[PDB]
Design a protein around this ligand. Sequence first.
Ligand SMILES: *C(=O)[C@H]([C@@H](C)O)[C@@]1(C)CC(S[C@@H]2CN[C@H](C(=O)N(C)C)C2)=C(C(=O)O)N1
Ligand SMILES: *C(=O)[C@H]([C@@H](C)O)[C@@]1(C)CC(S[C@@H]2CN[C@H](C(=O)N(C)C)C2)=C(C(=O)O)N1
Ligand SMILES: [Ca+2]
Ligand SMILES: [Cl-]
Ligand SMILES: [Cl-]
Ligand SMILES: [Cl-]
Ligand SMILES: [Cl-]
Ligand SMILES: [Cl-]
Ligand SMILES: [Cl-]
Ligand SMILES: [Cl-]
Lengths: 267, 265
Amino acid sequence: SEKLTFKTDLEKLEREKAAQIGVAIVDPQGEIVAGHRMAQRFAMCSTFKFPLAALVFERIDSGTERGDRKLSYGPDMIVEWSPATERFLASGHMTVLEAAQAAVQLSDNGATNLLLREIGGPAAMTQYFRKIGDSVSRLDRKEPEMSDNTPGDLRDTTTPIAMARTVAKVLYGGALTSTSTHTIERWLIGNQTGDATLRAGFPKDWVVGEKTGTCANGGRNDIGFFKAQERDYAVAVYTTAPKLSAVERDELVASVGQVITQLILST
Amino acid sequence: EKLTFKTDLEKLEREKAAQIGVAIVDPQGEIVAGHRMAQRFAMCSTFKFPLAALVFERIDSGTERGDRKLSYGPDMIVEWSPATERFLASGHMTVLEAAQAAVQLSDNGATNLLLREIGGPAAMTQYFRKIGDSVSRLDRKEPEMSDNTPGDLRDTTTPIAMARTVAKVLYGGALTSTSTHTIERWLIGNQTGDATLRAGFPKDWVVGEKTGTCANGGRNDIGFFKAQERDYAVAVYTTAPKLSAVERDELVASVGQVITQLILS
Ligand SMILES: *C(=O)[C@H]([C@@H](C)O)[C@@]1(C)CC(S[C@@H]2CN[C@H](C(=O)N(C)C)C2)=C(C(=O)O)N1
Ligand SMILES: *C(=O)[C@H]([C@@H](C)O)[C@@]1(C)CC(S[C@@H]2CN[C@H](C(=O)N(C)C)C2)=C(C(=O)O)N1
Ligand SMILES: [Ca+2]
Ligand SMILES: [Cl-]
Ligand SMILES: [Cl-]
Ligand SMILES: [Cl-]
Ligand SMILES: [Cl-]
Ligand SMILES: [Cl-]
Ligand SMILES: [Cl-]
Ligand SMILES: [Cl-]
C-alpha cells in the first residue's frame, strides 16, 4: 500500500543516514493520514515558536494583549541567534507583533525569550498547549538551553502526532480568528529559515508554510502545513541524526519531504 | 571638524580608488556636512525606501489598501527575490508584504510588483517631485535600473537630494504619524545593512537604513540616525570598481566612522 511504501522508504533513510525520523501528517480535523514514530518523544527546539505565536495571537484576539505594545529590553535579552533583537536593541524595544514575527520567521531566540518573559515563562506555554487539547507538548526552559536535547530528557519535548494535531488546531481547528489565522499562515509561508528543509522536498506548486528547528545532538525539525491537490494537511517532522553534517541534516529533512510527496500523490 | 571630515573622506577615496558622496542633514533638511553632495550617483536599491513611502502615502490617502493581494507568476522572479520566491506558490504578496520585503530584504521581485501597481518608473519620479525632490529620478525597473553605466543620468540621485528626501519622509510630515513610525521601524529592522553604515556608527545610536549594491562597484546606504538626542538624515553613495564586495562593505562602514567623528565633534 502507499502507507507501507511510506514506512519502508523512511526506514531506508533511517538506516542509511543513521537517523531516527518522526513524522505525523493529519487532515484539518486532526485525523491521521500517515506517520512514523508518531508517539516517540523528540525535542521541540525552535519549532515551539509557532505555537508561541498562536498563544500571543489568542491573547490579541481576546483583548488581553495589543500587538503594538512595546516590550522594552536591554543587552541581557540577547542570546545566540538573535538577529532582530540585536538590531532593535538601541531603539530599546520590540513590539509584541514584531517579536512574534521575528521568532517565527527568523527563529530569533531573544525575541522568543522576550515573549516568554511577557506571558509568564515556559509554564504559560505549556498551559496553552493543554488549553488547545495538547496533553503531550511541554515547554520547560527558555532559549537556547531548551534545545540541549539530552537523550531521554523529557523536558521541552513533543511527539509528532501531538504537534501535528496542534498545528491543525491552530490553522484549521478554530483556535484563532479568521484574520489571525490568515496572518499566521502567511508568516509560515514567508519563513526565512526553511528553504533547504521540507519545502525543498515538496513540489513547487504546493502551498507550504513551516517552522524549522535545530537542536544539539543532531536534531533537525520542520513543522507546518501544505496544500496539495485541493487538500489541506498539517505536518510535523522531527529527526535525530548525530553523525550527519548540518547540510546533510537539511538534505535529510528535504528527503522526508520527497517521501511525503510520494505518499500524498499516491493517496 | 569639517576639514577633518573632508580630509578623511579624500584619504579613503585616494587609497581605495573610490568616489564617496555623502550628505548629512538635520530634520528640516539643513546641511550638517557633505562631500560630492551634488554629484549624481546611481540610486540602485536605495530607491526602495522612497517607494515604500509612496505606498504608505497611497494607503494614508485611501487610494491603496495595505492588505490588497497582488497576484503574480514566476515571470516576476528576478535575481535577489527571496520573499517573492517563497510566496510564489501561494500566488500573491500583499501590498504591505511586498513593501516590507523590498525595504528589509531588498527583494527585487517585490519591488517590481509594487512598480507594476503604481504605473512604473514615471509614477515613482512623480512622487519624488511631490515631496520636493526635483533631482532623483527612476527610469527603469529592477534589476536593469542598477546597471550603473558610467555617466548615465538615468536612475540617479544626489546625496543631498536623497538625504533631504529621507528627512522629508521621516521628519517633514510626508506621512501620517503612524505610517512614519512604521517605516522608521522597518529601517531599523532592515536585514541587509549589518556590515555597512551601522557597522561604523556607535552602538547606542538609533539607526535605520536602506542599502544598495550596483554593477560597476556601487555601494550605497541611506537612512537616519539619532545621536546625542538629535536626529539626522544621511545618504551615502560610493563607487569603487576595483574593491571586492567585502571591501566595499568596509568602505561604507569606514564612511560611517568618518561621519561619527564629525557628529561627535
Ligand atoms: C531552534 O531550533 C534554534 C534555537 C534553539 O537556537 C535556532 C534559533 C537555531 C537554528 S539554525 C541557526 C540559525 N541560523 C544559523 C544558520 O543558518 N547558519 C548556518 C549560519 C544557524 C534554527 C533553525 O530554525 O534552523 N533555530
Ligand atoms: C540593490 O541595490 C540591489 C538590486 C539592484 O539587485 C540588491 C537587491 C542586491 C544587493 S546585494 C545582493 C543581495 N544579497 C546578496 C548578499 O548579500 N550575499 C552575500 C550573497 C548580494 C542589495 C543590497 O541592498 O545590498 N540590493
Ligand atoms: Ca509568469
Ligand atoms: Cl523607534
Ligand atoms: Cl482553543
Ligand atoms: Cl532571506
Ligand atoms: Cl560638497
Ligand atoms: Cl556642492
Ligand atoms: Cl495564502
Ligand atoms: Cl537576519
